Amino acid sequence: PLESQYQVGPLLGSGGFGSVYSGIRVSDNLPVAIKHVEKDRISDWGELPNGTRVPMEVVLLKKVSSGFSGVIRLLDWFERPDSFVLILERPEPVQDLFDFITERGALQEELARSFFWQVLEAVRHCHNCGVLHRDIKDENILIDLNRGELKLIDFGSGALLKDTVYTDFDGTRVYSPPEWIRYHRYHGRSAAVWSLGILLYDMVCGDIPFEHDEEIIRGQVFFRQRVSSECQHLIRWCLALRPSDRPTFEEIQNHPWMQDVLLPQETAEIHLHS
Ligand SMILES: COc1cc(-c2ccc3c(-c4ccccc4)[nH]nc3n2)ccc1O
Incomplete structure (x- = not known):
């Protein structure tokens, strides 16, 4: 019991x-x-x-x-x-990434890089086990403050990973991609890349880029914080209107902005017990 x-x-x-x-x-x-x-x-x-x-x-x-x-x-x-x-x-101890960003504002790019890298690794792992999370967002990420390790939570909106079209979706609308808004169909990986685009923006800018369907459909990204050109390119890339134009996970981790990430423990020593 x-x-x-x-x-x-x-x-x-x-x-x-x-x-x-x-x-x-x-x-x-x-x-x-x-x-x-x-x-x-x-x-x-x-x-x-x-x-x-x-x-x-x-x-x-x-x-x-x-x-x-x-x-x-x-x-x-x-x-x-x-x-x-x-x-x-x-x-x-633990803190939700949403609360961490709320209290701290836009993250420094060194820290967003470490965090975003870890999230990609976690999502890659999920996919490798045949799982599509479908609700990747700051609220569904915990920080292990001691170790500087991020952890995914809430697979309640998830699905088995498949290579064919999805027609259902029960995740967070402002994190959903143009294909879903417009056609109510999407493919798992390219939709996940879109949500990762939203997430990264939230990390470096302190908030999400789109609040309404129309803004999502238009796919214009305005940066309200100072963001490196490299990081802006990566974000604009993940947030391509056409799924086909979006990067693959490999292309993301090979992106120049992503090079030379900190180890999780380094990240904690530098940024978590600041
Ligand atoms: C991994 O899959 C799932 C994970 C969870 C979930 C949620 C909050 C959690 C906290 C926590 C501890 C302290 C504060 C806040 C949160 N620790 N561990 C958690 N796990 C819920 C549903 C899932 O499917």
Whole structure:
């Protein structure tokens, strides 16, 4: 039982990530996070080996929880009469990237580079395990302050990665690409590159570039902060209106702006205990 091996605590973020509470694995006092989702509110279901009917979030989580510390890992899960319970890693201390940027404003390019590199690595990992996140944004990224490591969270809007067209989407609209707004269809990788474009802009500029469908459709990027030419090119590239014109992950990590990133621990020593 859950009440048996974990000591449940208060809600986290007052409903920021939905119904997730802080907890402790009582056997070793491991900090965990405990997410509840009720069956009635589940739109997308999956099948686990051995045929157990389970929310897609769990299949995706099982596939990406391999020990790579770029994504928050699923330690365990339980089924209850009317809901499901997830036990997840809880970094300590930790801060959400959205709150980090809010408090700090536009990040210095050295720091945005380290962060953005880590996020790419995490997304590459997901794709390699057959998972498309679909909700990449600052709110879904945690910072492990001690180690300077970023971690992806919230795979609730995710899908199995496929090479064919997607026609559904339940993520954040201002992070969605022109194809979705205009046609309600997209391909996984080029849409993910678009959202990464939005994310990077948010990091260097302190906010998102588009607030309405029309701004997204137009694809004009105005920079309100001082941003290097190299970084501007990368952002404008990811935010190409035509999916085909967008870079591949390899092209992004080979971009000149991306060269000579800091190691996560270096990043923490320089920027996190500033
Ligand atoms: C990796 O997959 C998922 C992860 C989460 C999620 C959310 C908040 C989390 C915190 C935390 C700890 C302290 C403060 C704030 C957050 N720690 N670990 C978390 N995990 C929720 C759904 C998912 O599918």
